[PDB]
Amino acid sequence: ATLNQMHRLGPPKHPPGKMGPTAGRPQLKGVVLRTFIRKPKKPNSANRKCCRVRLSTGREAVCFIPGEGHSLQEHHVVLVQGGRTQDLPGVKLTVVRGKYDCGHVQKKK
């Protein structure tokens, strides 16, 4: 605006980033509650294998399992990361495949 205004208001500061689902950490350890299924948003349709998990942050969170096929039993321990899934509403947490109770999605050779 004017100079006195730009003086009184200071220069603009770049606002600190809002921490996401992982609350700033790269990954999270988690424990399974109930394996289940969700339906995608409109233009595309499927059914995605989801879990409900608890995080070492003591928060419960809905997360996504990548790949075709898996074994996920209650009380299994998992690792999770912050990939958001573009199909579904509100699932912000992927499960890392290959660690703990989820082994690398199997090969059919």
Give the footprint of RNA on this chain (CB under 7 A). Answer: 1-6, 8, 10-20, 22, 24-29, 40-41, 43-49, 55-56, 66-70, 79, 81-87, 89-90, 92, 96-99, 104, 107-108
> Quick one: which H or E segment has residue 4?
helix 3-8
Instruction: Report which residue type is found at 77.
Output: V
**Residue 61, token pair as written in the block:** 């969170």
Q: Build a one-symbol-per-residue string for 72-91: x at contacts with Mg ion by CB under 5 A, - elsewhere.
A: -----------x--------
In 3D space, the residue among 40, 45, 32, 44 whose CA is nearest the CA of residue 91 turns out to be 40
CB 32 within 8 A of CB 76: yes
In 3D space, the residue among 58, 51, 36, 37 whose CA is nearest the CA of residue 101 turns out to be 51
Q: Which does 13 bind (CB under 5 to 8 A by kind): Mg ion, RNA, none?
A: RNA
Nearer to RNA, 18 or 75 (CB): 18
Q: Which does 75 bind (CB under 5 to 8 A by kind): RNA, Mg ion, none?
A: none
- The footprint of Mg ion (CB under 5 A) covers 83
